[model samples]
Target: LQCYNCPNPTADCKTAVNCSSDFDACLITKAGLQVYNKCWKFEHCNFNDVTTRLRENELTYYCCKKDLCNFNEQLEN
Candidate 1:
């Protein structure tokens, strides 16, 4: 129902927003220090859609359900 939406968000990315009905999940993708979060569809819950950044790091991409489920991502580094 909600997610933290932002682009290259630093400490200020904590913007929790209500996701539209169309979106069924919350997704967070990390490229180094930059973090991206957005409302996402359940089926798109994978690194494939944004694999160019990965080319894959299991810890680099994550998906969760429910409100503000996209939280501070833990990285492998």
Candidate 2:
């Protein structure tokens, strides 16, 4: 499957790479911006099952089973 790893709100982003073993297609959105999209290893973090919200920004994450499903150009929609 394909994967991506880039910082949020940046124009310089990588397109796709072959995902490693046991990595799931994942996306992370902060506020209204697309912060991250790529293959995510579930054991890497504890933010999987929860959506955190702050006063000015909110963070949401999605992990999918399809290939390249996490790569979204317009995450707000």
Candidate 3:
């Protein structure tokens, strides 16, 4: 699988990653803000809600099972 972290939410990263068996591909997007993409630990892989309040901003978290599933994700709320 491929993975990379960047400040821009629409980053087209070409970095490679080796995910462990107990991990899942996760993408946490903060619209109009920073975006985080990587292999999150299996136990920590939970995408229960789409929108969550963090401090004062409202962010969205999108998770998927397949590789590179979180790229160029658009927010819908």
lDDT of 3 by residue, 32-74 (tens): 5556555554354444333322232345566556665656554
What lDDT, from 0 to 1, does candidate 2 have? Answer: 0.52
| Residue-level lDDT tens digits of model 2 in 1-77 | 66665544343366666777777545444444435554565554336333422122355555555556555554446
| Candidate 3, superposed: residue stretches over 4 Å from native | 5-12, 41-57, 74-77
**Order the candidates by lDDT, highest first — what do you get?**
1, 2, 3
Model 3: pairs clashing at backbone N, Cα or C within 3 Å? none
Ranking by TM-score: 1, 2, 3
Using Cα atoms with residue i matched to residue i, what is each candidate's TM-score against the true structure?
0.69, 0.52, 0.50
C-alpha lDDT (0 to 100) for residue 42 of candidate 3: 38
Provide the overall lDDT of each model, using Cα atoms, as 2-decimal numbers. 0.68, 0.52, 0.51
Q: Give the per-residue lDDT of model 1 (tens digit) for 1-77.
A: 88888755453488878987798777776667667676667676666765543355543566777678777743432
Which has the greatest lDDT?
1
Model 3, residue 6: displacement in angstroms? 5.1
